Design a protein around this ligand. Structure first.
Ligand code: NIO
Ligand code: ZN
Length: 257
């Protein structure tokens, strides 16, 4: 099945998921000079104060920190969105080296990693229904560069040794996702897709302009994870990013000049 290797990587995904070659695939290169400022875009509203994290899981492709999404506890609103989008999980994509790892690029620049906070439109009732809708999801993407440590990330880093291999999960309560956010909520936005199979075209992407800095030690611990299950041959979980896809008939809008 699909993955990030030579024989099952992103260039192969279209054979099982034909939408891989669709009209609104993600990620994309964000050309900052051709994005258009849209003064009518509203400020993002990130309401994470009541977030209830549950657990952290290694799913063989990344690790997800999952949240209780059965009430409006951690929601994204405003910006380009109509309605209320609930946080269900966040995860990262990262590289084998600091010069790569992000999915979106900025003027072709790759960051060391990229955080995805995945939210779904409450009007569709559950995540499964939402991914079937063109406005079903809102993913907040945040770039990571290597520099100073991010204190709010360290609790994630420290639990990774308990979910080294595919299928392992651990309790991960009381984690505050606000500790992963940059100062500025200035953003780019465009319509796109999940960046892993099933690659469904259901996402309003909101990519923050300002990266967060993480330490080399922090991203090194991401790179010690494994794609494989326990007792299978060890393959480090690195370079779990899909490269930029054609923009096609889309315009990236910016909340800022
Ligand atoms: O690509 C993603 O972020 C994704 C794919 C499937 C399910 N949830 C998220
Ligand atoms: Zn992702």
């Amino acid at each position: 099945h699909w993955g990030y290797g030579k024989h099952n990587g992103p260039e192969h995904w279209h054979k099982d998921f034909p939408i891989a070659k669709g009209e609104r695939q993600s990620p994309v290169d964000i050309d900052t000079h051709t994005a258009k400022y849209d003064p009518s875009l509203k400020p993002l509203s990130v309401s994470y104060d009541q977030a209830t994290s549950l657990r952290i899981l290694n799913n063989g492709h990344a690790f997800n920190v999952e949240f209780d999404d059965s009430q409006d506890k951690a929601v994204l609103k405003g910006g380009p969105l109509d309605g209320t989008y609930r946080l269900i999980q966040f995860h990262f994509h990262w590289g084998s080296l600091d010069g790569q790892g992000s999915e979106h690029t900025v003027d072709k620049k790759k960051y060391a990693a990229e955080l995805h906070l995945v939210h779904w439109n409450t009007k569709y009732g559950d995540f499964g229904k939402a991914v079937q809708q063109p406005d079903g999801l809102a993913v907040l993407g945040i770039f990571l560069k290597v520099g100073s440590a991010k204190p709010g990330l360290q609790k994630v880093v420290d639990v990774l040794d308990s979910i080294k291999t595919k299928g392992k999960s651990a309790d991960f309560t009381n984690f505050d996702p606000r500790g992963l956010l940059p100062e500025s909520l200035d953003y780019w936005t465009y319509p796109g897709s999940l960046t892993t199979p099933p690659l469904l075209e259901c996402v309003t992407w909101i990519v923050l302009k300002e990266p967060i800095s993480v330490s080399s030690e922090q991203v090194l611990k991401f790179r010690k994870l494994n794609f494989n299950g326990e007792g299978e041959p060890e393959e480090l979980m690195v370079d779990n990013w899909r490269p930029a896809q054609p923009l096609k008939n889309r315009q990236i809008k910016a909340s800022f000049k």
